[PDB]
Amino acid sequence: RLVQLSRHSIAFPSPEGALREPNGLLALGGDLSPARLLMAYQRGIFPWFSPGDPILWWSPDPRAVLWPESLHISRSMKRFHKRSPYRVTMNYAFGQVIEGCASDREEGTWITRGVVEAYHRLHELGHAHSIEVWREDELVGGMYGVAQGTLFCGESMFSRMENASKTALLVFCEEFIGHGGKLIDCQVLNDHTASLGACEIPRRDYLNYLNQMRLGRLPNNFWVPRCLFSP
Amino acid sequence: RLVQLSRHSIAFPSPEGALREPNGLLALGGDLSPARLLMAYQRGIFPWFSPGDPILWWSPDPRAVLWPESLHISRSMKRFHKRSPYRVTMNYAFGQVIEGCASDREEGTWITRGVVEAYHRLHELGHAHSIEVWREDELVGGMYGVAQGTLFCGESMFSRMENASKTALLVFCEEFIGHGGKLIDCQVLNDHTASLGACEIPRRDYLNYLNQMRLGRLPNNFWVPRCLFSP
Ligand SMILES: Nc1ncnc2c1ncn2[C@@H]1O[C@H](CO)[C@@H](OC(=O)[C@@H](N)Cc2ccccc2)[C@H]1O
């Protein structure tokens, strides 16, 4: 029952109508305007499409997700992290992180210049945030996403140095949990997310979770740029 | 006799010693740091000055105020709001609302890059909030201010489409009242504000209200970003 968004309205169809195959494809067209996106993440919808294609909106079923508590950290990583060679900051360099994500010529191929601006825009308005991983003064990895109350919608992550990506995710989760963070939406499950504790749950439930958590809150300063981890 | 603020501390002089004409002129100098700004609102003072001049602080007598309940709404406006073409949201795009007021070419000329950054910190820190009015996908109005308990200090409004500004206030007041909102600071009274039902109580009366409402509280999640009204 695919819907064709217009320049006019900013309203999305109901997730229930999403197609089974491809999984969750709900609507195409529209723009990546703050109001539109912010409206979409609020309803459990998210944009994803390959360069050259029109904007595609999804709300897959089942929905991959990560319980902060359940993050799985190997014994080796913990040893590594006990004596971590990195530093971790919050919203210190959103632009660089989303850039490194597009860099990786794979999962980040969809992150096009326009995609980068739409999200940078959210970060600038206080909704899209990033976790940066440093080695010296160099940014070696990180991750960004869109906060939805006590729920965090992961957008992507990148790594240019062994375990940088896990450090960011690791430390994020700790800060997140210690302050009220309830969930992490991973959208679609994959080997990486799976090897981390991401698990599927019915769309029907993710929407319940979403509706509840989007009205919750963390300390005011929680998303204020700062240092999260440093030896 | 007209105190100069010192960078050393965040202390302000009694408002009762403000000038009688220019009405409210109390002190100049200081800075626009969170600590200071918050202290000003805490004690019934607010900064205002045109580009070029030093920081000027005020606390006029009388003070313009708006009883959330006594908001005057014409019959054509209700007629219009019933079939409203706008969408109202809270703290979705503080940055843009403030820039919108800051560019209303007439009054918002005092809102400089400096002032914007200053209030943006308070928003980032969670004391400043904004009400956006959307027409489809575009921002056509809004309003921002500083939350002082059950009291709310209005800083500015801006409109790009008929009745946008009024919708913002309308929707706000309803919500505001709904959860314990008690008063809306209007700083100085003017034609528009007065047509909306704002009045004037003595500086000392307003100051009392300030103390009572400062401690007064609203639901813990009152300001979290969210839609307040769908067309
Ligand atoms: N098809 C697709 N849709 C969205 N995001 C995608 C896609 N393909 C790759 N990505 C991004 O690349 C990373 C690779 O790890 C993906 O990570 C995820 O599984 C995210 N959907 C959720 C998440 C992001 C950051 C941190 C934790 C979870 C994805 O972001």
Ligand SMILES: Nc1ncnc2c1ncn2[C@@H]1O[C@H](CO)[C@@H](OC(=O)[C@@H](N)Cc2ccccc2)[C@H]1O
């Ligand atoms: N001197 C002065 N101080 C503040 N704001 C001023 C001033 N002169 C003009 N303005 C702006 O013009 C509008 C006129 O309606 C003012 O709006 C206000 O009522 C604000 N002062 C307070 C307020 C903000 C939002 C919602 C309700 C009240 C102001 O923007």
